[PDB]
Swiss-Prot record:
The gene is PROK. Its EC number is 3.4.21.64. Disulfide bonds join 34-123, 178-249. Binds 2 calcium ions per subunit. This is Proteinase K. It is an enzyme of class 3 (hydrolase). GO terms for molecular function: metal ion binding; serine-type endopeptidase activity. The chain holds residues 106 to 384 of 384 of the full protein. Residues 7-279 form the Peptidase S8 domain.
Amino acid sequence: AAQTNAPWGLARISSTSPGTSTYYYDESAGQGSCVYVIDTGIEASHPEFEGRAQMVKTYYYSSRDGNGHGTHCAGTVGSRTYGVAKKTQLFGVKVLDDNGSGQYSTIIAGMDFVASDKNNRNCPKGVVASLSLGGGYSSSVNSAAARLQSSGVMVAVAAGNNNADARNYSPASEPSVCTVGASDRYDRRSSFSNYGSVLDIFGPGTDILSTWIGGSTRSISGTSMATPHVAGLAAYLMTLGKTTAASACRYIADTANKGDLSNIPFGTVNLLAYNNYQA
Ligand SMILES: [Ca+2]
Ligand SMILES: [Ca+2]
Ligand SMILES: [Cl-]
Ligand SMILES: [K+]
Ligand SMILES: [K+]
């Protein structure tokens, strides 16, 4: 299938070269997969979600996304126009308040919640979690991410936006999850993107158009925007039978566009998420 005039990031994920605007993907489109977006929540009523999104959990007085960030990440995972996996099921877990903040113990509880909650969902093709959040290093936070991955969930986490070595951030520094750096449309490392040997992959992160709250849309930038491309990619590949939750991060690294990004620091992977789709 072919989506013309797609967001640049979607076109980039299905391309061997920058500078194209059509997104190519197998029509299976992540059908029968699930992706949890652990974030400020998801405006499930947005027309772009088409009934495929819902809130399953909050830690605050509401499950409403009053920020917009979780909606944007979710729209990149699986919205009809702005998503990688256009037919996936989306589950919202509100660990971050409407300011985009959340205590580490709440974030941990959300990740353990998904590890159990997947047992209450229909996801024959596999389960992904997209974690577009971080703070300083915490072994508790890393361990929680490690359990979620261990339980059978493809975990994708933002490297962070400090233009620094992601070893000092969590859950970015957890070796067993998929740590995602950000690139721009000219294949430069995003200026804010974290880096380091703990990075597994890069996705589109700068000027990423997607859903927003109040049923609208906007472009914003961050390793938070790159993470859902990789999460949406994993869901899509799992529907295709190409990989599993334990192996998806490796499979994505293995099948990446290689050596193509500029300003990648020595010692950091030069790998750009790519679906390898032949139309
Ligand atoms: Ca990692
Ligand atoms: Ca890893
Ligand atoms: Cl409110
Ligand atoms: K630096
Ligand atoms: K190359």
